[PDB]
Each structure stands twice: as structure tokens, then as C-alpha cells.
């Protein structure tokens, strides 16, 4: 399953982030990708990233949720700090892990 | 069939959503993708996602429809809550399942 | 032929729809794709979709045409209801079927 | 040859159309593609499309030319009727046919 | 070599054209591609196209150059007639032919 | 591992850079890519680049960090000198190296 | 190595150019590609292109540098003559050549 997991990680492991504190946001695609990857690095739990190398989990199953909030310190960098984000494979990996 | 089902799930399984309560919507592509995946996670029935892993269905056949509505709580996030959505694989998978 | 037909279905089976009642239309690509799939589900005849699963046809050959009109109920949703649409494989599939 | 021809018509059989009667034209990419396929269906001679199924030609060789004009009736639909169009496959397939 | 030549022809044989007589030019991508193919058909010498079918050349080697000028009659069509153009295969195929 | 490392280097070795000293920045995609390449060359340590040719590291493991600052002299070229940059594979390669 | 070198030349041998004498530059992507190819043809040393055909080099190793300045005569064509340009394979091929 871990091999299939790394196929998912390479192909479709993407998250999408939009700012919360204040609907156009006047951010370009480069800024959007930068914010997404920053929130992936800081907000998403390390289990999501480390799962495909693997193939204590009792707390891990309930640890990760679908939608997340990250207070990424890009104030004066993108104009916002609080960002709400989501990623489609959250529930997919949750079901996989409940099966796994 | 289930292998074919996960093929369609990987390649062409996207839904499209547009707001209802009030034609430009001044929403960028990132916002559109975020709304699409949010409504896919919330509005779309779990059978649509879980079909390719399997390969009680009597109510499940009539459960889903082509066009759906999601009242996704993204106020001050994208500016709208009610979103009308559709995806091409709705009727396709309905026909496949009636055959299946 | 039916395998070839589903090849054209997956790769190049695309239709394009433009509003009729009143040349920019101030519609984004997401709205265009939504209208395309909506009219594909509604206006396009079920034979066009169901041809590659088979592989009464006397009425089917003259049933469909190249250009179509759909009065899709997207008023206050996209701003127009009447849409004229066309798709390239219409005449191609008509020729195939006349051969087939 | 005909197999090669079907390869080209899948990959590079694209025509481009621009309106004649009156340099921005304020037409979106969807409208451009719609006009392209419309004029391809109406203006381009059936020999160009039907060549890869074959593999009387004396008139066919001089029948088609590189650039074409189509008076496609999309007035109040895209804003123009007369369109000048061209595709790179015209002279290439003419040379192929002269060889063939 | 001719097989390799037709490989570069299918993948990378693209030319770029810009108008001369008078830096934004307010031409869309469709118009740019149309001008590119028009000047490719007109300005570029038939050796560039016909090389990969082959595999008198003494003057033919010095015939073509990297950049070209073409006065394509697209007045009231794109707004300019004189276009300076260049393609990536010019010096590459010149070296290939000097070797060949 | 080093072969896999060069697979990542070819596929997904990308960085994103945003200006620091003062949220739109009115920089095009070409300028964004140029800034990314500059800061990838000057800010990213040579070990990140040279890892896939190898396959003293005690200081090298703690040498690099996820987010970096790059002070590149493109003033009057893109309008800014200080940029903050990040790349996806920083943590992945740090974990790989710690395992390695 | 030369086979690998021509793989890089086909895939990722691209350069980026921005004007120097005077941050938006109001140049479209077609103009950007045209400027890039012009400067690649004139500025980049013939060794960079001719390396994958071979596979006197003592001066060649120090001959080229990563960033270049090229004074391309497209005044009244794109609005600028002086351009600073870069290409990603500079340091990579310099290391390869020092090894080779």
C-alpha cells in the first residue's frame, strides 16, 4: 500500500489555501502555490507525508482532519497570516488507514 | 469494473460548482478548485467515492443525482454559501451501476 | 469499433456551447465547462454516449445533428438559458454509423 | 500512409479562423475554438477528413487550398459571419496526395 | 537522419512572428498562432518542410537564414502586414545539413 | 537512492520566490521563473543539487533549511532585491539524508 | 553523456530574458519566447548547443557564464535592445564538463 501511497504523494498530493481574516483575493498563481506549500510544510501532520515510506496510530487516525487552518507568517509577504486549506486525499487516506 | 472505476476516479472525476444566491463571479481558478473539492467532500455521496474499492444498493441507485446543491460554509471565505454543482460521471456511473 | 468509439469518447468527445439571447459573453472558463457538460447531459442524445458500450438505428441515424440547442435552466446561475452548441465528432460518428 | 494520416488528424488537424468584416477581436478562447470547429465542419472539404479511411482525385487535388473563407452564420452568436481560416495540414496533405 | 528530422518537425518545428511597422501588440494567442502558421507556409523555404521526407543543395544551404521577413497580406485581418519571424530549427538544421 | 534523487531533481525540483521589501507584485510568469532560477542558484546550497551524482555531512545536514532568504541584484530588472523562497523537497531530502 | 546531454537539450534547454534599460514590461508570452530564442541564438556560445554532438576545451570551460547580457536589435520590435538572460543548464553543464 505504501507504494500506492507514494504514487498518490507524487501525483495528487496537493492542498489549496485561501486567507481568512479580511471575493477576489488579488493573489497570483505563484503566490497561491507558495502559500499552499508553506501550509503543507507547517500545518499538515507529518503522518500524511511519512505514510508511503512506512508501508501509536490510535491517536494518528483522529489527529488529521480534512480542512485545516494555518497561521503562516507571510504577513507583508502575501498580506495575510490565517489561511483555511483543504486537500482531497485527506478522507481517502483516512479510509485507507482505517482499512490499514 | 472497479479497476476501470478507479481509472475514471483518477483521470476525469471532477465536479464543477457555481454560487446560487446573488454573469461573472469574480472568482479565481484557485477559489473555483477549492469550492469544487469542498463540495465534492461534503455534498457528493460517499458511494461515488467508494465505488472503485468495492469492485443495500436499491436506495443507493436513486440516492445520487446529476446536479447537486451544497450549502458550504465559506462566508467571508469565498462570499457565497449555496453552490449548484454537477459532474459528468454522475449519469455515467448511474448507468454503469444499473448494469452492475 | 466500439473500443475505438470509447477512445474518441475519452479523449476528444467535447462540445462547446454559447448563449443565444442577447461578442464577449463575460463567462469564465469554469462557467463555460459547466455549461458544456450541462448541455451534454441534457441536449445530447443518449445514443452518442451509449454507442461505445454496445460495440432501431434507422431513427437514430437521423435523430442527431451537428449543431444543437439547449434551453438549460441556468438563469440567474450563468445569466443565459438558450445555448447553441456543437461538437466535432457529430458528423464523424454519423459517417461511422452509416458505415456501421 | 492512411495510418500516418489518422495519426496527424488526431494530433495536428487544427484550423484557425479570424473574422473578416469590421487588431483585437474580443473573442475568448472558447469562442475561437467554437468558430474553428464550425468552419472546419462547413468549409473544409470532405476529402480532407475522409482521407485516413480510404488509405476522381484529379478534381480533388485542385479542390482544396491552404487558406479558406467561410460565411458561417454566427451573427449575434459570435458577432461576425465571414471568417478567414487556415491549417498547416493543407499543403502537407496536398504534397502527400501528389505523391499518393 | 530524416526520421530524426521529422521528429523535430512534429515536436519542435515552431516559428515566432512579430509585426514590424508601427511594446504591446494587442494580439491574442489565436492571432499569434494564425500569423505564425501563415508566415511558416509563406516565408519559410520548402527545404525546411521537405527535408525529413528526403532522408542542387549548394545554393540551398545558403538559401535560408535564421530570421526572416514576410509581408503577409493580413490588413484588416490582424492590422499588420510586415512580420519578422524566426524558428528554432534554422541554425540547428543548417548545422545538420552542413554535416549532411 | 541517488537515481531516485535525480528523478526528483528532474521532475519536481522547483522553488518559489516572493519579494520581501515593500498583495499583488505585478510580476509576470517569466519574471517569476527567472527569479526562481536566480535564487535557486545562489541561495540553495550546492549539496541539494549535487546529491544525485554522489549517490563531512554532519554540518551539511543542519546547513540548509526549508525557507531561505536570497538577496539578488535584479533591481531595475524585476524591481526587488530581497526575496523569500521555499521549495517542496527541502524536508523530504532532509529526512532522506537523516535516513541516509 | 552526449546522449544524456541531448536529452537535456530537448527537454529543459530554455532561457529567460528581461530588458535592462528602462516591474511590468508589458510583453506577451509570444514576445518573451521570441526574445528568448533570439538571445539564445546570438548570445549563448556555440559550445552549449554543440556539446551533445561531440559526445581546446580549456578556454571553453571558462568561456561561458550563467547569466549573460545580449544587445539584440529588436528596438521598435519589442521596445528594448539590451537584455539580461539566464539558462538553468549553465552550472549543470559546467560541472558536467569539469567532470568531462
C-alpha cell, D18: 479570424
Of G12, G23, G91, the CB nearest to F78: G23
For A25, counting Cβ atoms within 10 Å of its Cβ (0-12 exposed, 13-18 middle, 19+ buried), the class is buried
In angstroms, this model's resolution equals: 3.4
Domain parsing of chain D, residue ranges = 2-99
* Alpha-carbon span E60 to E41, nearest angstrom: 18
User: How far away is chain B from the Cα of A58, in angstroms, using its nearest Cα?
Assistant: 23
* Alpha-carbon span E17 to E32, nearest angstrom: 7
* Alpha-carbon span D17 to D38, nearest angstrom: 10
Total residues found in chain B within this entry: 100
List the determination method.
cryo-EM
Nearest 10 degrees: CA dihedral of F75, F78, F81, F86?
-160
For A20, counting Cβ atoms within 10 Å of its Cβ (0-12 exposed, 13-18 middle, 19+ buried), the class is middle
Among residues B100, B84, B2, B89, which one has the least CA distance to residue B35? B84
Crossing angle between the packed helical segments F2-12 and F46-54, to the nearest 10 degrees: 130
**Neighbouring chains to A with at least 3 Cβ pairs closer than 8 Å:** B, F
Q: Are F12 and F88 in contact (CB under 8 A)?
A: yes
**Neighbouring chains to F with at least 3 Cβ pairs closer than 8 Å:** A, G
C-alpha cell, D54: 480510404
For C81, counting Cβ atoms within 10 Å of its Cβ (0-12 exposed, 13-18 middle, 19+ buried), the class is middle
**Contact between chains at C66 and D28 (C-beta distance less than 8 A):** no
* Alpha-carbon span B78 to A23, nearest angstrom: 5
* Alpha-carbon span C78 to B25, nearest angstrom: 9
Q: Which of residues 21-80 of A touch B (CB under 8 A)?
A: 22-25, 27, 29, 32, 66-67
C-alpha cell, G66: 550563467
* Alpha-carbon span E63 to E90, nearest angstrom: 11
* Chain centre to alpha carbon of residue D31: 16
Q: Is the dihedral of CA G50, G56, G57, G60 positive or negative?
A: negative
Q: How many CA atoms lie within 13 A of F46 on its CB side?
A: 4
DSSP type of residue E68: E
Amino acid at each position: 500500500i505504501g507504494v500506492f501511497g507514494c504514487t498518490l504523494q507524487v501525483m495528487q498530493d496537493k492542498i489549496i489555501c485561501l486567507p481568512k481574516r479580511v471575493l477576489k483575493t488579488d493573489l497570483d498563481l505563484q503566490q497561491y502555490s507558495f502559500i499552499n506549500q508553506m501550509c503543507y510544510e507547517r500545518a499538515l501532520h507529518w503522518y500524511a507525508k511519512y505514510f508511503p515510506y512506512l508501508v501509536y496510530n490510535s491517536a494518528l487516525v483522529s489527529k488529521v482532519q480534512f480542512t485545516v487552518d494555518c497561521n503562516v507568517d507571510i504577513q507583508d509577504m502575501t498580506g495575510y497570516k490565517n489561511f483555511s486549506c483543504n486537500h482531497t486525499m485527506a478522507h481517502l487516506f483516512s479510509k485507507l488507514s482505517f482499512c490499514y
